[PDB]
């Protein structure tokens, strides 16, 4: 979304308040990946969310590059890199579209060089077909493509908040109209309508996980497929700070037509307290997201 390129998009709050990804998932990715480790490119990298994690959580790469359209996001990524130089000595950031690999050099762009391409919490914004064709043109043989993301969390132990987990994001009088489409609908549906092309990728692996399954011992026991479990301990304040990082929230908050309305993130806190009056706003509780991933090896 162009929202994340706004000069005043709060990329610092994105970095502080957005979820990152668990070691078990990275271990799975490394078990999937075969072969050399010269170059990892993380497209749509944001403020280095997955990029900086991968420097530590995967086996070493000679170089890791995060690319993104947003200068705002890349600047934050660079700030974090510079804070731990190093830990991140082999990580660089580039302003580039997810299908533009010109930063590889005139002699390497579109010449099937990269070992692994990741696209994390962003591929719903892409023309998926155009993106996968570019990835194919930019991966070495049997190079990995790994796409993953998340949406629509619940609090497993607080089913009283399930209605808020609909109304906060999707209230018809609130944030609902502000989600950009079709990206939001694609994300919510776990990119189920977009497929790695079997002419371009093989050993294709797909997973889907509904966070409500955490409430059901049978469903957890019977998963066929190593789900991505994005579980976090958050206070109500921290969850509200995550709301404040949403693209839809940025747009809602800045729309002059909403100037006299109660802030939606603040409303979340107030309404949660009304539903669970024993809960303090600094008590940690578990939140879990719906997730997906798609893995392929370049043919
Ligand atoms: N076509 C495109 N090419 C590259 N980046 C894109 C893009 N469309 C959207 N983006 C970027 O997608 C990012 C989504 S938010 C950052 C997601 C981050 N990878 C994470 O794991 O949380 C934004 O920074 C936005 O600028
Ligand atoms: C980078 O985040 C997303 O693309 C999805 C999203 C929010 C979310 O589902 O947490 C948004 O702000 O657009």
Curated annotation (Swiss-Prot):
<comment type="similarity">
    <text>Belongs to the methyltransferase superfamily. Tam family.</text>
</comment>
<dbReference type="GO" id="GO:0046547">
    <property type="term" value="F:trans-aconitate 3-methyltransferase activity"/>
</dbReference>
<dbReference type="GO" id="GO:0005829">
    <property type="term" value="C:cytosol"/>
</dbReference>
<keyword id="KW-0963">Cytoplasm</keyword>
<protein>
    <recommendedName>
        <fullName>Trans-aconitate 3-methyltransferase</fullName>
        <ecNumber>2.1.1.145</ecNumber>
    </recommendedName>
</protein>
<keyword id="KW-0007">Acetylation</keyword>
<keyword id="KW-0489">Methyltransferase</keyword>
<feature type="modified residue" description="N-acetylserine">
    <location>
        <position position="2"/>
    </location>
</feature>
<dbReference type="InterPro" id="IPR051052">
    <property type="entry name" value="Diverse_substrate_MTase"/>
</dbReference>
<keyword id="KW-0808">Transferase</keyword>
<dbReference type="InterPro" id="IPR029063">
    <property type="entry name" value="SAM-dependent_MTases_sf"/>
</dbReference>
<keyword id="KW-0949">S-adenosyl-L-methionine</keyword>
<comment type="function">
    <text>Catalyzes the S-adenosylmethionine monomethyl esterification of trans-aconitate and 3-isopropylmalate at high affinity and of other molecules like cis-aconitate, isocitrate, and citrate at lower velocities and affinities. The function of trans-aconitate methylation appears to be in reducing the toxicity of this spontaneous breakdown product of cis-aconitate.</text>
</comment>
<dbReference type="GO" id="GO:0032259">
    <property type="term" value="P:methylation"/>
</dbReference>
<dbReference type="InterPro" id="IPR025714">
    <property type="entry name" value="Methyltranfer_dom"/>
</dbReference>
<dbReference type="GO" id="GO:0034198">
    <property type="term" value="P:cellular response to amino acid starvation"/>
</dbReference>
<dbReference type="Pfam" id="PF13847">
    <property type="entry name" value="Methyltransf_31"/>
</dbReference>
């Amino acid at each position: 979304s162009s929202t994340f390129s706004a000069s005043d998009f709060n990329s610092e709050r994105y970095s502080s308040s957005r979820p990152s990804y668990p070691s078990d998932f990275y271990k799975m990715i490394d078990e999937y990946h075969d072969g050399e480790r010269k170059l990892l490119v993380d497209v749509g990298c944001g403020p280095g969310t997955a990029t900086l994690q991968m420097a530590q959580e995967l086996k070493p790469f000679e170089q890791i590059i995060g690319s993104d359209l947003s200068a705002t996001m890349i600047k934050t990524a660079e700030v974090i890199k510079e804070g731990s130089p190093d830990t991140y000595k082999n990580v660089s950031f580039k302003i580039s579209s997810s299908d533009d690999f010109k930063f590889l050099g005139a002699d390497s762009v579109d010449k099937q060089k990269i070992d692994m391409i990741t696209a994390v919490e962003c591929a719903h914004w892409f023309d998926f077909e155009k993106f996968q064709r570019s990835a194919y043109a930019n991966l070495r043989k049997d190079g990995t493509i790994a796409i993953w993301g998340y949406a629509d969390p619940i609090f497993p132990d607080y089913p009283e908040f399930d209605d808020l987990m609909i109304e906060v994001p999707y209230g018809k009088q609130g944030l609902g109209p502000y989600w950009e489409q079709p990206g939001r609908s694609r994300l919510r549906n776990m990119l189920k309508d977009s497929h790695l092309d079997p002419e371009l990728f093989h050993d294709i692996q797909v997973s889907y996980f509904c966070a409500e399954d955490v409430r059901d011992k049978v469903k957890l026991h019977q998963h066929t497929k190593k789900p991505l479990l994005i579980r976090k301990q958050v206070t109500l304040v921290e969850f509200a700070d995550y709301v404040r990082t949403w693209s839809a929230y940025h747009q809602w908050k800045q729309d002059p037509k909403n100037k006299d309305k109660e802030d939606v993130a603040d409303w979340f806190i107030k309404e949660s307290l009304r539903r669970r009056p024993e809960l303090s706003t600094n008590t940690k509780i578990e939140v879990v997201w719906n997730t997906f991933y798609k893995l392929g090896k370049r043919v």
